[PDB]
Design a protein around this ligand. Structure first.
Ligand SMILES: CC(C)n1nnnc1SCc1c(C(=O)O)sc2cccc(F)c12
Length: 167
């Protein structure tokens, strides 16, 4: 039993809710919140901008030190950093950005990072301003992630579309 409330069950291990991931994280304080990051950990917009704003820019400060030490992530890769006021940890995961011309085939590799954590609160990778087909991303999620994932979908019309089209 965990404290995630109001989620629709898609599969044995994947759940979904129309919710602001910042507000869900503040309420639940999950062990892991997933950020939809880029390789430079520049948290400008979308999920990343929203999470970073909620941390008062502390996520960005920490991220800049990470990059200065380690260099950029790979598309499809991840790193674990602090969750600040939102979660114990933030798993920064880089899905492909179609609006940068990046290979959507890397989406499965991106979701594989979730399997290193027993329970996660996450957005749909590569959706929104990353430009991928969200129905496809949800399919890749359910077919790749084996650990317990709680998906928070910000856009109400998107949530409705995803539920109504899910196989
Ligand atoms: C958190 C919330 C307040 N917020 N604010 N600004 N953007 C958002 S989330 C829009 C969105 C998704 C969704 O609608 O769930 S998944 C997804 C994946 C990558 C980038 C995204 F932008 C995005």
């Amino acid at each position: 039993v965990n404290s995630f409330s109001g989620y629709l069950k898609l599969t044995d291990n994947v759940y979904i809710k129309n919710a602001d991931i910042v507000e869900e994280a503040k309420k639940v304080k999950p062990t892991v919140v997933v950020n939809a990051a880029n390789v430079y950990l520049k948290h400008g917009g979308g999920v990343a901008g929203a999470l970073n704003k909620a941390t008062n820019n502390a996520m960005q400060v920490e991220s800049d030190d990470y990059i200065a030490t380690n260099g950029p992530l790979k598309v499809g890769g991840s790193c674990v950093l602090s969750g600040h006021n939102l979660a114990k940890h933030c798993l920064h995961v880089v899905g492909p950005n179609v609006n940068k011309g990046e290979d959507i085939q890397l989406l499965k590799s991106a979701y594989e990072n979730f399997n290193q954590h027993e329970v996660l609160l996450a957005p749909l990778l590569s959706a929104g301003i990353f430009g991928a087909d969200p129905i496809h991303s949800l399919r890749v999620c359910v077919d790749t992630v084996r650990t317990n994932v709680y998906l928070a979908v910000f856009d109400k019309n998107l949530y409705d579309k995803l539920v109504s089209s899910f196989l």
